[model samples]
Target: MAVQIGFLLFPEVQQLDLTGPHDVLASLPDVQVHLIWKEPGPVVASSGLVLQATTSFADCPPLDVICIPGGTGVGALMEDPQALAFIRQQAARARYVTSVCTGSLVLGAAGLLQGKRATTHWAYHELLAPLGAIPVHERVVRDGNLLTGAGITAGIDFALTLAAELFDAATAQRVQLQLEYAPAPPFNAGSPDTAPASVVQQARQRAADSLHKRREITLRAAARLAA
Candidate 1:
């Protein structure tokens, strides 16, 4: 049987977080991919990109893999009962429950990350600890059926790894070759550890508001989950 994979789509989602993995996963042979939302329609991403959902929450079939991508909208999802319930339900049956970027926060809010080792965007990775997750600082992390990726570009690496798990190393290598996936970044500022201190400080300042708000929302959600 072909593998069925679905990604949850919502307003203000990070375009790369979804599209990066979408491109990779969709290229896999014998796999069906779906973009799902609470309702079927066009959803605008944080970067102003417009993407249409292929399925609704109620209409989505049982999936082999369920992936949630993150962006500014994730904070609200921490308090969204419907979205959380859907994630929880799908995750219960999915062979792989996964997320990219701050989407791990949504999974944590759904109580799925409790006691699992996971990763997210560096700006928010530490917050996972309060949500009952052991935060790991890696491009991608796998804890049994759960897999998570850090930041936006990591979704590509995450999907490639998942492809290997779903199929084989040979299949993954073929896909990688087809996509010509090789990295030779011109700048050494991709990560905080390697980036100049000035760049890291600027990034922190830019993300301050979103990070602060997310922390508040996550704290509330974590408390509720604990309750």
Candidate 2:
């Protein structure tokens, strides 16, 4: 049977969050991949790369996995009734309900993360608790059928893990090799723990406004979830 995988796309979505996992997941045999949104059209990513959604929420087929990728756009999505409802509908039946980076917050907003052990971009890690998620500081965290990845590059690792879970370790390894998934990053500044304090400060500073907005949106969304 062909495995249907759908990725939710939105304005300003961090392109890598979707692309990294996308490249890996495409390696699987007989896999059907979809870029989904409220409507089928072009979506601009945070980095200015344009992505196209092939399916809309109303037309998306039954998916084996439904994954959402993160970006600054998530703050807007948190409050979108249509987006949250779509996530709720898909998550109820998808074999794997997953997200990469801050996309986990969208899953939470949809009430899917209640008591689910998950992870997200480090900056928004603490926000998960309000949505009923117990977060871990890891590249990829999985609880039952819900898989969440940390920031950016971790989406690749998240996808590889899902491939292993769905098929086998050997199959994932084959995909890994095909993609040459070896890590030899030029710098160790990928995480707060490894990065220089000043560097982390600057990165946080750059994203301050968006981060604050996300926090506010998350809190508001949590309240809605509660009510």
Candidate 3:
């Protein structure tokens, strides 16, 4: 059977997080990957970019894998019952469930990370603890079926790793070559711990403030998951 993958989308979602994996997944000859959301239309990304969806949350076929990309949408989605329910239900059935950036927090809010090791955008790593996840400060973290990759560019790394995991090293290597997937970041501050003192402080401030919004949203959609 052909492997079916679904990418969960929402308003203000991260662009790179979704697109990076979409590119990697497109490399799969037998994989039919699609964008899914509560409605059957377009969702604007955080960068004011609009992405079209090919399926609705309720209409997606049985999923073999799912990728949830994070952004402002995550803080809001943690509260959306319709979306959260779809996440919880689909992830339970998926052979591989993964997220990029703050997307891991959405999975956490859905209670899929219960006692599981996961990772997220480094800025929000600390926030996953409340959701029963043991957050790791790594670029890509795999704990059983749940896989998470860190911030922006980390999505590409995650996809490369997942590519190797789902297919084979040769296939993944072919994709790596196809994407020219070599990294050469100019600075070391891209991660929370690696960033400069001021940058880390600012990111921490933002992540902390985002928690208030998440707390409110998660309460309505995932209060029962709280300890």
Candidate 4:
């Protein structure tokens, strides 16, 4: 049987969170991937990239895997009953319920992450506990069928892990090689642990306002989940 994977696309989503995984997941044979949204149309990403949604929520078929990518727009989704409901419905049956970056918060809002181990962007990693999740600092964390990837670039690693889970390590290795996935950054500033204190402080300052708003919405959403 053909494996079907659906990616939830929305306004201001981090494009690479979707594209990185798409590049790897789409490479697998007998797999059908679809970008789905509330409505079918063009959506602008966080970095102003435009992507078209080929499937609408109502038209989306049963998917073997459901993936949600996060961004500034994800905060707005926390209060969206329609979006949460859709995620809940899909997650209840999908073989894998996955997310990239802040998208895991959406899953949490849908009440799917309670007691599950998960991970998200470093900026918002601590927020997971309020939603009943145990946060891990790894690039990708999986508890049962709930797979989550950390910040933007982690989507590639997350997808490759999924590829291995779905098939085999050999298959994932081939896909990685095909994509030239080796990484050797000139600077060792990827994580908070390795980044210079000044750089980390600057990054935090840059995202301060956004993080504040995210915390507000997430706390409210977490309250809703508890209620």
Candidate 5:
């Protein structure tokens, strides 16, 4: 059987976090990737570009893997019952489940990261502990069947490791080479730790309200899961 990976697509999701891994996975033989959302049709990404979904939650079959990418939508998605239910359900049945960037917060909100070591975007890594997760401060953390990637570019690394799990290290290496994956960036402003304190502070200020709203939603979800 062909392996299927479903991505929960929504408005304002980080374009790279979703599409980068989608590109890698789509290159694999006998692998199918589907864009999924609450409704079928077009959804705009965080960059203001639109994309189409192949299916919805109701129509999707059990996934071999389910990957949730993070962005502004993650904060809002944390409080969405229907979206959370879809994630929780797919994750329960999928052989492997993963998230990238702020998407880890969404998984944490679904109670999937509880008792598991995970990582998210560096700026928000501390928040995962509140959901009963052992937070890792690296670009990627693999805890059992749940693997999480930190920030945007980390999605490529995350999926490469997942390729190892599904196939082999050799296959992953080939895929990496096939993509001509090389790390060459002119600036080093990707993470809060690497960025200037002033830059970090400004970013934190910009995200303050979203982070506050996320905390409320996650707390409620964690409490419900605990109960």
Candidate 6:
């Protein structure tokens, strides 16, 4: 039987988070990809990319790997018990429990990251600790069976790494080669540490409102964890 993989799909999701990994994993031999949401239908990503969900959360089958992808919508998910419940249920039986970007934050709400080593989008990296994750500064981090990725683009990097773990390095390399995976940056501004101060300031200011609301919701999530 093919290895089953599920990606959580939601309104305002980052399309690449679900699609990049889906493309990589589905390309591999004997793997099935399923888009899972509260219901099965067309869902629009934060980037305005529309994708269809094949499985609803309640109808999801047993999956070998369950991944949560990040986006602005994750803030709303932090307090969503139904979403958290589905994650908790899948994680208890899945072979791998993973997340990319702010998806880790939702995993935190699901009570999966407590005392786990994980990483998420750099802009929200510090928030992981309160969610009970020891935030790591890497593109991908694996703590036991819980693996996580940092930032938006890291989803691809994270998926490749997971591919290597599931199959082998050679197979992953083949997939990488098939996809012509080559990254050449046009500028030295991918990360805050490398970007100019003004650019970082502008980015932070642009994200301030979202971050503020996230902070408040995170505290609630954390308090729930504590309770």
Scored by lDDT, the top model is: 1
lDDT of 4 by residue, 51-122 (tens): 999899899989999999999899988899999999988888899999999999899888888999999999
- The TM-score values for the models, in the order shown, are 0.99, 0.98, 0.92, 0.98, 0.93, 0.98
**lDDT string, candidate 5, 127-194, tens digits:** 89988899888888998899899988899999898888888899899999999998887889787768
Model 4: lDDT equals: 0.93
Residue 165 of model 1 has an lDDT of 99
Candidate 5 residue spans exceeding 4 A from truth? none
Q: RMSD, model 5, all Cα superposed?
A: 1.6
Off by over 4 Å in 6: none
Return whichever of 2 and 4 wins on TM-score.
Answer: 4
In model 1, which residue pairs have backbone atoms overlapping below 3 Å? Answer: none
Residues 1-227 of candidate 2: C-alpha lDDT, one tens digit per residue? 89999999999999999999999998998899999998999999988999999998888999999999999899888999999998888888999999999999999999999998999998888889988998888889989999999998899999999999989999999999999888899999999999999999999898788878877898999999888
* Whole-structure CA lDDT of model 6: 0.92
In TM-score terms, candidate 6 sits at: 0.98
What lDDT is reached at residue 164 by model 5? Answer: 88
**Candidate 6 clashing pairs?**
none
Candidate 5: Cα lDDT at 143: 88
Instruction: Tell me the number of clashing residue pairs for each predicted model.
Output: 0, 0, 0, 0, 0, 0
lDDT values, one for every candidate: 0.94, 0.92, 0.84, 0.93, 0.88, 0.92
- List candidate 1 stretches off by more than 4 Å: none
Model 1 per-residue lDDT tens digits across residues 35-143 = 9998889999998999999999999999999999999999889999999999999998999999999999999999999999999999888789999999888899999
Off by over 4 Å in 2: none
Arranged by lDDT with the best first, the candidates are: 1, 4, 2, 6, 5, 3
Name the candidate, 1 or 2, with the larger TM-score value. Answer: 1
TM-score of 2: 0.98
Q: Which candidate is the best by TM-score?
A: 1
